[PDB]
Short mmCIF file of C-alpha atoms in Angstrom, two decimals:
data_model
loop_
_atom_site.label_atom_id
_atom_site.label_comp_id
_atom_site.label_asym_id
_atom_site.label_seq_id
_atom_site.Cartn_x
_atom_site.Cartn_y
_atom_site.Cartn_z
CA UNK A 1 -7.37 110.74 -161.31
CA UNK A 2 -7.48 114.09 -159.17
CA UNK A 3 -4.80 116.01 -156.78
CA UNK A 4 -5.29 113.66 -154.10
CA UNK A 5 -4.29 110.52 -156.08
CA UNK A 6 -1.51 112.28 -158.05
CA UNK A 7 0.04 113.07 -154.56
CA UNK A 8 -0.30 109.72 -153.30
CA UNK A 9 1.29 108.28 -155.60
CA UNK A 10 4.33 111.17 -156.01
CA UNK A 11 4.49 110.97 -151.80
CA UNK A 12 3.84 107.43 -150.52
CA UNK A 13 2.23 106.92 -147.70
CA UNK A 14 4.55 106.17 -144.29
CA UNK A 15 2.86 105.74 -141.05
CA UNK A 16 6.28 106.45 -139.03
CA UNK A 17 8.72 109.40 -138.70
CA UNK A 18 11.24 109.32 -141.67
CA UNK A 19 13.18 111.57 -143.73
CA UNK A 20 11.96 112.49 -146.99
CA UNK A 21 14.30 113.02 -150.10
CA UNK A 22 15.87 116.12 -148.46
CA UNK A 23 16.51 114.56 -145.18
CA UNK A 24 13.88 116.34 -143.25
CA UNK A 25 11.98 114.57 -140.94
CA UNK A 26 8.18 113.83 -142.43
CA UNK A 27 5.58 111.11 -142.18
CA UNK A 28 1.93 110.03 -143.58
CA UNK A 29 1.44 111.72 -147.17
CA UNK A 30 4.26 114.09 -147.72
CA UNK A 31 3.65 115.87 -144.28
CA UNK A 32 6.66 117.74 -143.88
CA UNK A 33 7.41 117.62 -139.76
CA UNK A 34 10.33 119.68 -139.46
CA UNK A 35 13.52 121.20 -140.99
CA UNK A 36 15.16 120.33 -137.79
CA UNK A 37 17.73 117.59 -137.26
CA UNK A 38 16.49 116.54 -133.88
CA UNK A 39 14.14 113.65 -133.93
CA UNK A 40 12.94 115.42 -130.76
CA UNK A 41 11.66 118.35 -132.13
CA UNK A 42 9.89 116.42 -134.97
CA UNK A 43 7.92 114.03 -132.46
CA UNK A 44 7.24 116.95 -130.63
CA UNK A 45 5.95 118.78 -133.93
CA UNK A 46 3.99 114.99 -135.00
CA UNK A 47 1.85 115.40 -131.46
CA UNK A 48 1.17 118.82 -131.68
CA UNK A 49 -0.03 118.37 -134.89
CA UNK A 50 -2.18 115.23 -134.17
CA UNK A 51 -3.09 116.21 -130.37
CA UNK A 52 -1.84 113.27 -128.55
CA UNK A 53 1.34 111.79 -127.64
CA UNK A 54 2.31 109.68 -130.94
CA UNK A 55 5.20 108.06 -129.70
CA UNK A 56 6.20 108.62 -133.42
CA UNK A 57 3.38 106.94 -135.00
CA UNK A 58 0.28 107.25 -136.72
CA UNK A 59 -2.68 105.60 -137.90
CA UNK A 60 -3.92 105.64 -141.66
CA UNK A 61 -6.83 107.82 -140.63
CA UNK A 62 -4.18 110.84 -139.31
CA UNK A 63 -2.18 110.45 -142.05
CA UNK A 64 -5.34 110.94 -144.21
CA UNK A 65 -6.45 113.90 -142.00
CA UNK A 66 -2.93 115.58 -142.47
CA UNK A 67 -3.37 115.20 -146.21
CA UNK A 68 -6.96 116.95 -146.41
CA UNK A 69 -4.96 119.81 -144.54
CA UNK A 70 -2.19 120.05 -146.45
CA UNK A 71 -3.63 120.03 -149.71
CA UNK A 72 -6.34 122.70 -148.64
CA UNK A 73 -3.85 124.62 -147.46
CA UNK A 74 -1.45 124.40 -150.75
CA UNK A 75 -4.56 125.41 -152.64
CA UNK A 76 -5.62 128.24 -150.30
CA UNK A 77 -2.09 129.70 -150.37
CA UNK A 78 -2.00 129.39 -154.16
CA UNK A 79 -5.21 131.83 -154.16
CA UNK A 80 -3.64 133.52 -151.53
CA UNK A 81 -0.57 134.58 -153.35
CA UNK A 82 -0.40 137.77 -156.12
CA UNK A 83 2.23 135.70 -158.27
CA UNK A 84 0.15 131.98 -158.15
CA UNK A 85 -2.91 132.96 -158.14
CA UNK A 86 -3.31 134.65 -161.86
CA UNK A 87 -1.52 131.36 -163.14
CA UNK A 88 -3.77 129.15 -161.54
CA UNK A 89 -6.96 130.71 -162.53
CA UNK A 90 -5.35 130.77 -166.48
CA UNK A 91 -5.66 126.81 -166.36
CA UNK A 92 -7.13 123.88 -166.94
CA UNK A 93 -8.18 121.81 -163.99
CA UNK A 94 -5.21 118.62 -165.05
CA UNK A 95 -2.72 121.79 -165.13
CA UNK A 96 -4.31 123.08 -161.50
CA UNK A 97 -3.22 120.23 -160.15
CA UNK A 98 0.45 120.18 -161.80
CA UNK A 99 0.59 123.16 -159.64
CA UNK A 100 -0.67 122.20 -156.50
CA UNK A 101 1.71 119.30 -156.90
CA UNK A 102 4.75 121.96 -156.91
CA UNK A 103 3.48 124.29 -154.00
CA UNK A 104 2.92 120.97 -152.04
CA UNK A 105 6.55 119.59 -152.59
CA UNK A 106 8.13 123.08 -152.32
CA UNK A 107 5.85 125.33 -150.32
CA UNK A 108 4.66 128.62 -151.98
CA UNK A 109 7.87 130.70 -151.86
CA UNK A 110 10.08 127.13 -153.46
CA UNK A 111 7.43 127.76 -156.70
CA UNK A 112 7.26 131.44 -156.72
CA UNK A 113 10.64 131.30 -157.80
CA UNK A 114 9.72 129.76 -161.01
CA UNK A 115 8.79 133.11 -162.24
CA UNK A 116 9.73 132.33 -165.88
CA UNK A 117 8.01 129.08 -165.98
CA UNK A 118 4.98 130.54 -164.70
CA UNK A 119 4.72 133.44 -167.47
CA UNK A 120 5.01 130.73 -170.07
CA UNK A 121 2.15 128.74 -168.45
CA UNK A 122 -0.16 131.65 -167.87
CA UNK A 123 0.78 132.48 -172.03
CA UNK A 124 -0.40 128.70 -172.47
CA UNK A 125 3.12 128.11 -174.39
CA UNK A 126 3.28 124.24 -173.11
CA UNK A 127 6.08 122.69 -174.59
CA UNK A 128 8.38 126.26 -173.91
CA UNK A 129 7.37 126.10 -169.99
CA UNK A 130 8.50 122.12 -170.13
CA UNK A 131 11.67 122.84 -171.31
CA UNK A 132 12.20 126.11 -169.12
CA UNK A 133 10.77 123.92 -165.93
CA UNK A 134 13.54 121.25 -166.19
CA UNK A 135 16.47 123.90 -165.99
CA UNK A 136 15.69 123.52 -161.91
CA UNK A 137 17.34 122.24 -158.99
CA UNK A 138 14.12 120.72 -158.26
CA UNK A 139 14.30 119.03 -161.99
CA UNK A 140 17.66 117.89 -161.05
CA UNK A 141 16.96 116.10 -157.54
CA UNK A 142 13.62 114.97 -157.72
CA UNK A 143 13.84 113.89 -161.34
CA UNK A 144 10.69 111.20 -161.42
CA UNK A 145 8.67 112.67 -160.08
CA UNK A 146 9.61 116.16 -162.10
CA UNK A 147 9.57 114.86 -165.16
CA UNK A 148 5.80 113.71 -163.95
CA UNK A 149 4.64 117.18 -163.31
CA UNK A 150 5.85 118.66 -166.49
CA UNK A 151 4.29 115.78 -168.42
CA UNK A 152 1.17 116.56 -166.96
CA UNK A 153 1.88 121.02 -167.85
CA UNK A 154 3.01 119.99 -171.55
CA UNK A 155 0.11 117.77 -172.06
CA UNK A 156 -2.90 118.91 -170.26
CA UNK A 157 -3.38 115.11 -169.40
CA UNK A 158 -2.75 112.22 -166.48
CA UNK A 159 -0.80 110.44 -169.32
CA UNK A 160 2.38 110.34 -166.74
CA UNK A 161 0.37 109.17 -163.77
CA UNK A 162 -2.00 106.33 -165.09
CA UNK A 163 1.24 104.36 -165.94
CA UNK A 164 1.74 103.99 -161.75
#
């Protein structure tokens, strides 16, 4: 199992425009389009991203392409960042990718609100940051796939994943 996998599974894979769990307008792997209600501005945002005219559709290939961005990009933000990147260099690589998972989902500035969380991961106190993780709206919409990621922190393994 590796990052790539682990967001496959959490993300699906959907070759035409549709709304993700927060309504906002995504397609392929988790590619987030637009925060935007029009579905103008997000087929606008799907060709400039791709570099042709879509028509609001894309082939397995793009999607894949969009996912080798996006997950570079989560990680290179991650290093990026003075609050992320301390916590990610205290881990293991199964932990690394709990937290690519998170900046992924939430973007950088959804995770770097999980200031407490991150102390206890960075002091290695597992089963403390699992509990304090869950006390989240992001817990509280997205259970499944929460209760996933903090598997993965408390344990250190792909227990949660290799089930699906």
């Amino acid at each position: 199992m590796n990052i790539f996998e682990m967001l496959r599974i959490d993300e699906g894979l959907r070759l035409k425009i549709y709304k993700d769990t927060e309504g906002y307008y995504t397609i392929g792997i988790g590619h987030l389009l637009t925060k935007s209600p029009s579905l103008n501005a997000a087929k606008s945002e799907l060709d400039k991203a791709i570099g042709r005219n879509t028509n609001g559709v894309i082939t397995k290939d793009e999607a894949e392409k969009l996912f080798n961005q996006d997950v570079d990009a989560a990680v290179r933000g991650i290093l990026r960042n003075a609050h992320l990147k301390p916590v990610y260099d205290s881990l293991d690589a199964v932990r690394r990718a709990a937290l690519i998972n998170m900046v992924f989902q939430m973007g950088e500035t959804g995770v770097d609100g999980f200031t407490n969380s991150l102390r206890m991961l960075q002091q290695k106190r597992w089963d403390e940051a699992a509990v304090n993780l869950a006390k989240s709206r992001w817990y509280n919409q997205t259970p499944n796939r929460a209760k996933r990621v903090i598997t993965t922190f408390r344990t250190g393994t792909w227990d949660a994943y290799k089930n699906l």
